[PDB]
Amino acid sequence: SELHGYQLEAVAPALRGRNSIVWLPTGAGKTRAAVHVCRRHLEGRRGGRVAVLVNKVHLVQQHLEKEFHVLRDAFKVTAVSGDSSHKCFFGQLAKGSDVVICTAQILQNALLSGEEEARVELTDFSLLVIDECHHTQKEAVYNKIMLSYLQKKLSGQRDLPQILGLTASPGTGGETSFEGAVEHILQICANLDTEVIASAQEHAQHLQSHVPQPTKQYDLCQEREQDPFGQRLKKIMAQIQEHMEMPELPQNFGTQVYEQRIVELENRAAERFCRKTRVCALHLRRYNDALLINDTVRMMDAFQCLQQFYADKKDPTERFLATTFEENRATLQALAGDQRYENPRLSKLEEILQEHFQPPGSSRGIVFTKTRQSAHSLLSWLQDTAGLCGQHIRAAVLTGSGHSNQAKGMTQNEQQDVITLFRYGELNLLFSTSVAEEGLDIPECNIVVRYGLMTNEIAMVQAQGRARAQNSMYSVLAKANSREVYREQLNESLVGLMERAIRAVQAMPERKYRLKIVELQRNAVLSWQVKEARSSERRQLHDPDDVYFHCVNCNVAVCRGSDIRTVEAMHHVNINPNFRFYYTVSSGKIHFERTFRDWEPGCRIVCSECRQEWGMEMIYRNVTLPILSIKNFVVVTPDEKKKYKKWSTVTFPIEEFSYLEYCSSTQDES
RNA sequence: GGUACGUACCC
RNA sequence: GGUACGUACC
Ligand SMILES: Nc1ncnc2c1ncn2[C@@H]1O[C@H](COP(=O)(O)OP(=O)(O)O)[C@@H](O)[C@H]1O
Ligand code: ALF
Ligand SMILES: [Mg+2]
Ligand SMILES: [Mg+2]
Ligand SMILES: [Zn+2]
Numbered sequence: 001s002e003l004h005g006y007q008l009e010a011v012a013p014a015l016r017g018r019n020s021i022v023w024l025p026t027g028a029g030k031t032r033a034a035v036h037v038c039r040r041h042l043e044g045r046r047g048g049r050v051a052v053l054v055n056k057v058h059l060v061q062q063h064l065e066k067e068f069h070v071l072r073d074a075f076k077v078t079a080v081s082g083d084s085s086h087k088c089f090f091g092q093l094a095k096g097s098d099v100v101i102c103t104a105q106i107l108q109n110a111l112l113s114g115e116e117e118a119r120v121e122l123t124d125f126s127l128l129v130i131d132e133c134h135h136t137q138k139e140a141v142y143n144k145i146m147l148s149y150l151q152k153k154l155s156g157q158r159d160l161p162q163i164l165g166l167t168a169s170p171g172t173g174g175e176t177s178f179e180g181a182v183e184h185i186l187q188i189c190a191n192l193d194t195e196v197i198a199s200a201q202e203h204a205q206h207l208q209s210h211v212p213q214p215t216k217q218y219d220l221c222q223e224r225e226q227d228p229f230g231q232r233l234k235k236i237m238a239q240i241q242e243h244m245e246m247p248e249l250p251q252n253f254g255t256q257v258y259e260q261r262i263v264e265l266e267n268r269a270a271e272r273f274c275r276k277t278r279v280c281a282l283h284l285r286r287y288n289d290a291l292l293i294n295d296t297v298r299m300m301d302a303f304q305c306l307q308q309f310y311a312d313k314k315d316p317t318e319r320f321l322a323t324t325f326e327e328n329r330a331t332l333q334a335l336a337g338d339q340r341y342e343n344p345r346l347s348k349l350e351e352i353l354q355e356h357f358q359p360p361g362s363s364r365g366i367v368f369t370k371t372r373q374s375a376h377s378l379l380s381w382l383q384d385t386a387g388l389c390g391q392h393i394r395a396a397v398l399t400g401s402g403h404s405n406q407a408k409g410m411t412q413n414e415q416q417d418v419i420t421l422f423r424y425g426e427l428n429l430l431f432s433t434s435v436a437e438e439g440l441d442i443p444e445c446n447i448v449v450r451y452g453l454m455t456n457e458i459a460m461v462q463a464q465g466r467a468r469a470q471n472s473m474y475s476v477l478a479k480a481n482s483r484e485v486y487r488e489q490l491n492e493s494l495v496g497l498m499e500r501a502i503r504a505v506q507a508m509p510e511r512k513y514r515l516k517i518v519e520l521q522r523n524a525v526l527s528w529q530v531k532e533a534r535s536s537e538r539r540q541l542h543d544p545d546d547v548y549f550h551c552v553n554c555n556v557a558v559c560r561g562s563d564i565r566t567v568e569a570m571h572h573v574n575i576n577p578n579f580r581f582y583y584t585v586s587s588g589k590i591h592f593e594r595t596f597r598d599w600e601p602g603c604r605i606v607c608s609e610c611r612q613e614w615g616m617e618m619i620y621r622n623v624t625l626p627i628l629s630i631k632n633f634v635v636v637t638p639d640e641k642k643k644y645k646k647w648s649t650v651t652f653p654i655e656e657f658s659y660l661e662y663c664s665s666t667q668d669e670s
Numbered sequence: 671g672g673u674a675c676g677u678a679c680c681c
Numbered sequence: 682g683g684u685a686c687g688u689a690c691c
Contacts, residue, residue, distance in 0.1 A: 260684040570673040
């Protein structure tokens with residue numbers, strides 16, 4: 001497994017100490033090239049230290065086990081992710097290592113830490129390797145780390161680390177002209193403090209006939225001729241809107257636009273406390289989710305989302321709605337049972353799998369879907385489909401750690417189990433989210449299907465690339481004449497523009513490039529400063545005593561701004577000793593997969609008057625504190641009443657929690 | 671469960 | 682300015 005010519009060529013500038021981006025195709029071997037750069041870096045000085053940053057939990061282990069472990073003949077290499085996190089302080093672990101591999105946010109947390117044992121500076125490393133470095137833009141973690149690097153650089157700081165970015169796809173950043181695309185490439189160079197974009201110019205022929213391209217096919221599907229299940233949902237949505245007695249109610253049932261309008265209505269009804277309107281809007285949204293699920297997967301998947309909503313449950317509005325569902329329930333379930341009205345997305349997916357998993361399972365595939373819920377539903381569909389039950393498909397779901405009431409996440413270990421069985425064919429088919437669109441290496445994977453996705457060209461290129469095998473195939477499975485098909489074709493062209501843009505940046509005169517980089521780095525550090533000042537202005541508009549929180553459901557006042565403190569600059573706790581008379585504990589003890597350094601979860605908490613979900617208890621060392629979720633309240637200030645979805649935009653200051661001070665004050669009372 | 675960011679969409 | 686989803690951290 002000695003380095004290919006093009007790998008040695010792409011790291012020549014890195015070996016000379018220059019900051020670079022290594023631009024090589026998906027599956028070309030950027031990781032092994034980085035390892036070689038790390039070895040020579042560490043051999044060439046004493047006391048060097050490398051950090052290797054990734055953007056998914058699963059890439060930490062993959063990169064350690066498949067590539068970086070070889071450095072252990074001479075050097076100390078440690079991996080840190082979230083799951084393991086809580087045992088060691090990161091500062092101690094890094095400083096005791098020659099190479100640390102971690103998700104970027106782990107490093108960022110250490111860079112911001114107040115504790116001496118956890119804290120790190122950028123100057124504690126001599127080389128940073130940034131995997132999938134195209135994410136180093138905007139306010140992503142990668143770019144927060146690098147903007148601090150730029151601030152320091154521009155302020156004269158010395159011995160900042162060398163930067164080695166790795167990517168197959170810098171992208172065009174939404175730009176469709178050559179001018180724009182070039183401007184985007186230079187911004188990424190500026191963000192990463194890049195001196196050279198290194199590629200395989202002199203080994204372009206070896207790289208062509210070695211790293212194979214999958215052959216590409218459009219597997220287009222038609223709209224259902226007859227959708228009586230959908231038609232019936234739409235009738236009910238109209239009946240509910242009639243009952244609401246409101247003009248200018250939107251009519252485009254079964255779309256993301258309708259979903260936006262109806263949630264925006266629900267926000268307004270919460271803000272003005274129109275209880276009737278808010279309740280109807282909440283139900284209508286649920287009918288709209290069912291239509292969307294219906295278009296994506298099975299009728300019965302859509303039916304079950306709706307039925308679980310009405311089964312969990314008085315006042316006259318809710319009673320109208322319960323009755324309306326009950327009137328239609330049996331008919332909806334019977335329609336969902338009928339094979340005549342099958343989703344042609346699914347018929348089309350069946351053909352593909354039928355053709356490519358015969359002989360029974362020589363193929364090795366990933367079907368990409370947008371949502372975790374869709375991936376689970378597709379697995380169920382596979383298992384209850386006879387046309388495939390006969391061939392031997394051992395399938396599983398792969399998701400990241402994202403989580404909601406619609407679908408839970410998968411931990412590091414649970415992801416790893418699926419990946420390991422897929423690698424050598426114990427599993428031969430994954431239903432996956434974008435968790436696995438980049439970086440994942442399965443040499444034998446020979447089939448990628450992208451199931452009705454709407455993404456940028458980076459995600460298209462990257463997901464294709466998971467098919468590492470010779471003779472791979474890539475399928476676009478989408479609706480004919482859709483926006484999704486249009487975007488796919490546009491993205492193909494945007495990949496070409498991206499290439500043209502990079503080559504133009506690569507051939508620029510050195511003086512003209514350096515001045516442009518300088519100009520862009522300056523504007524970045526100034527733009528950030530201005531943005532920070534503007535965020536702080538907003539944060540100090542109101543005294544915390546003049547802000548009141550109301551329950552989003554019943555509008556009762558529950559606490560003031562001055563009752564709130566932050567734990568780890570994230571979790572908003574109410575420290576008022578009488579807040580306990582306003583909330584009720586509504587569950588038994590909640591258990592997470594991950595465990596944290598200073599706290600564990602207690603029970604869910606609800607509004608004592610209406611039972612609306614508010615948040616959860618945190619058992620922080622020796623005390624129990626209620627954590628509030630901003631989405632479950634209307635915030636009332638002197639100027640307005642506003643339902644917030646984030647805490648960063650609130651108009652009053654919130655201090656950090658002090659465990660010490662809190663104990664003193666609570667222990668004085670009884 | 672909490673927090674943040676990214677992508678897509680609408681304005 | 683919002684809506685949805687995803688991932689990462691806790
Ligand atoms: N010089 C080499 N010889 C043989 N195999 C290699 C070489 N370099 C990389 N590989 C293998 O090629 C595959 C793709 O590498 P990877 O680092 O995942 O690609 P990417 O460039 O997309 O990060 C891996 O399985 C890796 O072990
Ligand atoms: F470009 Al890669 F894994 F880094 F496909
Ligand atoms: Mg949540
Ligand atoms: Mg890679
Ligand atoms: Zn309430």
